[PDB]
């Protein structure tokens, strides 16, 4: 990663600098699958279920419970999808 204007000094990048580059959460595959399949055993699939914690119950630090984004942010993500302006 380099700085487009290079001669002006300094190159520091902080969390606030990655506007709009918030990393999407990972959906709960198991949950979706299960739901659909037992609906099958009986529609009404809680696809939605962004997963909150990992196996060892380590949090993914979601921005909120009813959102699809985590407090994690990435530079790559931003340069590619963030605001071009």
Swiss-Prot record:
Q: What induces it?
A: Expressed in the late phase of the viral replicative cycle.
Mapped onto the parent protein, the portion here is: 261 to 416 of 571
Family designation: Belongs to the adenoviridae penton family.
- Additional comment: All late proteins expressed from the major late promoter are produced by alternative splicing and alternative polyadenylation of the same gene giving rise to non-overlapping ORFs. A leader sequence is present in the N-terminus of all these mRNAs and is recognized by the viral shutoff protein to provide expression although conventional translation via ribosome scanning from the cap has been shut off in the host cell.
Name of the protein in its database record:
Penton protein
Supply the source organism's classification: Viruses, Varidnaviria, Bamfordvirae, Preplasmiviricota, Tectiliviricetes
The domain comment in this protein's record states: The cell attachment RGD motif is exposed at the virion surface and is involved in binding to the integrin heterodimer ITGAV-ITGB5.
Where it sits in the cell: the answer is:
Virion; Host nucleus
Function of the molecule: Major capsid protein that self-associates to form penton base pentamers, each in the shape of a pentagon, situated at the 12 vertices of the pseudo T=25 capsid. Involved in virus secondary attachment to host cell after initial attachment by the fiber protein. Binds host integrin heterodimer ITGAV-ITGB5 (alphaV-beta5) thereby triggering clathrin-mediated endocytosis of virions. Mediates initial virus attachment to CXADR-negative cells. Binding to integrins ITGAV-ITGB5 also seems to induce macropinocytosis uptake of the virus.
What is the protein's quaternary organization?
Interacts (via the cell attachment site RGD) with host heterodimer ITGAV-ITGB5; this interaction promotes virus internalization. Interacts with host WWP1 and WWP2. Interacts with the fiber protein (via N-terminal tail region). Interacts with the capsid vertex protein; this interaction binds the penton base to neighboring peripentonal hexons.
């Amino acid at each position: 990663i380099r700085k487009r204007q290079p001669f002006q000094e300094g190159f520091r990048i902080t969390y606030d600098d990655l506007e709009g580059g918030n990393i999407p959460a990972l959906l709960d595959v198991d949950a979706y699958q299960a739901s659909l399949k037992d609906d099958t055993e009986q529609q009404k699939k809680p696809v939605i279920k962004p997963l909150t914690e990992d196996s060892k119950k380590r949090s993914y630090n979601l921005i909120s419970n009813d959102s699809t984004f985590t407090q994690y942010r990435s530079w790559y993500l931003a340069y590619n999808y963030g605001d071009p302006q």
